[PDB]
Design a protein around this ligand. Structure first.
Ligand code: HEM
Length: 450
């Protein structure tokens, strides 16, 4: 006896089109508050787009992402636009194509291989510290600062040293190809990319430049402290052979796309919360000072992650309030039942870390910043999928441990060398694209500790 999904209140004629455009994050929370855990969003005018379903329960998220993963596919139009824009890499691939890619890439994402990149993160963070030590204003805009820093960390991990050259090209090329794909995947009309419109021409020129850069970097590595491009080029097994040149580029691009804004968002918001919460900052500082030796102390290592649990708890709470992926899209193959509600075959649907992380059934006083929610005991008192920023199940984030290594060890250096104080508006307005979008500045004063 499957129930029908309630339609989220919206415009009499346009449905949720205006609400999802103006304030999608507030629309998602209202949908749960007024209509429940399985809802349907209507578009207008009638006949433009099929109803998009939404699952906000932890148990429904476990079903969509893990228990019944086979019924929920990456067949949404957005995924097709990303594949056309950056190639059919590990994030967008499905079936046999994905299985061969997973067989060849998983070896590069082992805890030991990832832990080997700890010194690169520590060096990049010490570099940011020296630059911040010479800021005459003593102030930073964290969204902008962490956007640069995160690309530098993932790019050092990918391409090694002296790649500020490649950084500036990627910095200006990749975001445009992502916007092109996001805007087309969410659009109600799609003129072919071959069509010679000014926008489609600009995107193909952007693609050419980035593709050629990637191919040159990859071809230089065709000729341990090895970079990830070197290990992707040397990936091979008996059944799958090795990755081709197009396959190599698709993975480099997907790693850059999946690790640049995601880690930036987490770093900026963790630092912003610590800037607005002095007691929690003092706790992270006393922990950093005890493990690394204080201002002017030693570089953090991968093993220091076990000795930095409050910082880990601050990060998880930042990713609860500010999930870098606020929604995860899927498409139903066959009729399904989630929380007693029917999700039809062919239906585009989405789980939302943004809503489930603020759900009153799992989160007391959900908008309060409290790292103590992530003690092992508190985690046991709540369902597993109440917190899922890296997703879950077979398609969970492969760089989850890398992101935590870069965040914990990164923030450890910055808190060991600087005190943070929020300046100006502390409420950063938020939107949603591929990732959580900052629609406001996160200003902060950096005070050198030595
Ligand atoms: C070092 C940084 C990162 C890298 C290189 C990276 C890479 C990737 C890759 C390759 C995938 C596809 C995994 C697969 O299908 O087998 C993925 C999935 C995912 N990543 Fe990450 N990631 C990083 C950081 C983050 C962070 C900080 C978040 C925080 C929100 C995040 C959230 C996700 C989510 C939700 C998925 C699942 C998407 C889905 O199921 O459709 N990633 N990541």
């Amino acid at each position: 006896g499957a129930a029908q999904a309630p339609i989220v209140a919206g415009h009499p004629l346009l449905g949720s089109m205006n609400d999802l455009l103006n304030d999608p994050l507030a629309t998602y929370l209202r949908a749960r508050r007024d209509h429940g855990d399985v809802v349907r969003f209507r578009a207008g005018p009638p006949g433009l787009r099929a109803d998009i379903y939404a699952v906000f329960s932890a148990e429904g998220a476990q079903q969509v992402l893990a228990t019944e993963s086979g019924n929920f596919r990456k067949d949404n139009v957005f995924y097709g636009e990303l594949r056309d824009s950056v190639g059919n890499g590990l994030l967008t691939s499905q079936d046999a194509t994905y299985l061969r890619q997973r067989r060849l890439v998983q070896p590069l994402f082992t805890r030991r291989r990832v832990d080997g990149y700890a010194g690169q993160v520590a060096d990049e963070a010490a570099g940011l510290a020296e630059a911040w030590r010479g800021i005459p204003g003593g102030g930073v805009e964290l969204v902008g600062e962490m956007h640069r820093f995160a690309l530098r960390v993932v790019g050092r991990i990918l391409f090694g040293t002296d790649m500020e050259t490649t950084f500036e090209v990627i910095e200006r090329t990749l975001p445009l190809l992502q916007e092109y794909a996001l805007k087309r995947g969410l659009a109600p009309v799609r003129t072919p990319r071959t069509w010679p419109t000014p926008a489609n021409r600009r995107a193909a020129r952007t693609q050419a430049e980035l593709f050629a850069l990637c191919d040159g970097i990859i071809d230089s590595r065709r000729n341990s402290g090895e970079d990830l491009v070197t290990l992707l080029v040397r990936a091979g097994n008996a059944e799958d052979g090795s990755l081709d040149a197009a396959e190599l580029r698709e993975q480099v691009l997907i790693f850059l796309l999946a690790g640049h804004e995601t880690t930036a968002t987490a770093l900026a918001f963790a630092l912003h919360l610590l800037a607005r919460h002095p007691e929690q900052q003092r706790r992270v500082r006393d922990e950093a000072d005890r493990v690394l030796g204080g201002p002017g102390g030693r570089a953090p290592t991968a093993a220091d992650m076990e000795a930095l649990p409050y910082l880990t708890m601050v990060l998880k709470e930042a990713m609860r309030l500010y999930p870098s992926a606020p929604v995860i899209g899927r498409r139903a193959v066959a009729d399904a039942e989630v929380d007693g509600v029917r999700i039809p075959a062919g239906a585009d649907l989405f789980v939302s870390p943004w809503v489930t992380h603020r759900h009153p059934d799992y989160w007391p006083d959900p908008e309060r910043f409290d790292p103590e929610r992530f003690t092992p005991e508190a985690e046991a008192g709540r369902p597993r999928y109440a917190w899922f920023p890296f997703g879950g199940g077979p398609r969970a984030c492969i760089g989850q441990h890398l992101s935590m290594l870069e965040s914990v060890l990164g923030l450890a250096v910055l808190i060991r060398e600087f005190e943070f104080e929020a300046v100006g508006e502390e409420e950063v307005p938020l939107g949603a694209g591929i990732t959580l979008l900052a629609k406001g500045p996160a200003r902060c004063r950096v005070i050198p500790r030595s």
